[PDB]
């Protein structure tokens, strides 16, 4: 290939910039690549599915850990109808004092936004109660992603 | 091609030929450090005076450190462009013919190693120019307005 | 005269790959340190709101 991209020789001979562009759109594609066969295609499909699952698992692990480190679940139990949820702490070096003012809500020690993804009702319906539960779940999910 | 007084004149060609980016009679590293200190003295002004801490007695050091950071970023960009476009043993691509037609030695400034010397010189010169503008703006600072 | 000083006080800064390494690691370390050591007087973030906030509609939730 002698240069990017490594999957289509026809592109590599494009001194026009569109090379880079089509060096992105036609990467995941497998039929159009050069020197591709059936069983190779299937093994690639398998590796890609594993990667996708790794991504999903890391995503949900991050959800859990962030709630566990800055969320409100524990003290949200005591009144799920008068204490808004919390998503994650704000650290924005572009704010002014009134910004920091109008974001510290729901009973926190800094600017935080309200978690709207419904994850609290989910993790509360099954019956979880403490931040330690969330830590354990996050560790398990992270190890599963690595696996 | 068209040759207007702008693109073709004694004084304009003279000026453009005298600035360091074309005086091939000097080492490329020295031209690099010269342009670097030039831009270093250049950029400190607005960055400091109009920065987001201008109403604070720290605005000087703030603007100067920001200028230094921008200089570092651009030196990174220079080195990156050089390693991207310039190979390490291949010839030069500088104009080797002057206006009269004197076949010029391939400008060592337009070589991989030459571009590297240029980048290093520019970075060091930008740092020096920034700190010099600081020391001349916040110690010996009467005859200016800021 | 000035050429020797300009050469010697920026002599190790000539190798290009070394130059990328040094600039990148130095920039990272510097920004991390200055942000971790940011003083609250010049940054409205390094301190909290320090006032009692407003409750949302419908009581607090």
């Amino acid at each position: 290939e002698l240069r990017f991209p490594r999957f289509s020789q026809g592109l590599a001979q494009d001194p026009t910039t569109r090379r880079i562009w089509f060096g992105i759109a036609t990467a995941h594609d497998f039929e159009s690549h050069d020197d591709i066969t059936e069983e190779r295609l299937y093994q690639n499909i398998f590796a890609s599915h594993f990667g996708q699952l790794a991504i999903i698992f890391l995503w949900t692990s991050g959800n859990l850990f962030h709630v566990a480190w800055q969320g409100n679940f524990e003290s949200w139990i005591q009144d799920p109808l008068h204490v808004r949820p919390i998503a994650h702490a704000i650290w924005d070096p572009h704010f002014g004092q009134p910004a920091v003012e109008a974001f510290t809500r729901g009973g926190a020690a800094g600017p935080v936004n309200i978690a709207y993804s419904g994850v609290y009702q989910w993790w509360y319906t099954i019956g979880l109660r403490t931040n330690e539960d969330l830590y354990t779940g996050a560790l398990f999910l992270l190890f599963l992603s690595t696996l | 091609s068209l040759e207007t007084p702008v693109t073709s004149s004694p004084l304009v060609a003279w000026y453009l030929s005298n600035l360091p980016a074309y005086r091939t009679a000097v080492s490329p590293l020295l031209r690099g450090i010269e342009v670097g200190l030039a831009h270093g003295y250049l950029l400190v002004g607005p960055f400091a005076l109009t920065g987001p801490l201008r109403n604070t007695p720290v605005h000087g050091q703030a603007g100067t450190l920001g200028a230094i950071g921008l200089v570092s970023i651009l030196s990174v960009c220079l080195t990156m462009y050089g390693v991207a476009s310039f190979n390490e043993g291949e010839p030069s691509t500088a104009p080797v013919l002057t206006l009269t037609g004197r076949k010029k030695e391939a400008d060592k400034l337009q070589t991989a190693e030459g571009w590297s010397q240029f980048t290093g010189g520019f970075f060091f010169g930008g740092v020096s120019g920034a700190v010099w503008a600081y020391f001349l703006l916040y110690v010996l600072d009467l005859p200016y307005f800021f | 005269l000035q050429s020797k000083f300009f050469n010697t006080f920026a002599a190790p800064f000539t190798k290009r790959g070394l130059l990328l390494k040094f600039l990148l690691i130095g920039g990272g370390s510097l920004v991390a340190y200055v942000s971790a050591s940011a003083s609250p007087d010049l940054l409205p973030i390094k301190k909290g709101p320090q006032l009692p906030p407003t409750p949302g509609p419908r009581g607090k939730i």
Partner: peptide
């Protein structure tokens, strides 16, 4: 605290090194 260490890193220096690495890559010529 820890945000002040990490957010600036994943905002400026890590994206910078990623961008320059991919620049160097796509500009390769073997």
């Amino acid at each position: 605290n820890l945000p002040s260490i990490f957010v600036p890193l994943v905002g400026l220096v890590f994206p910078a090194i990623a961008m320059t690495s991919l620049f160097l890559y796509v500009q390769k010529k073997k």
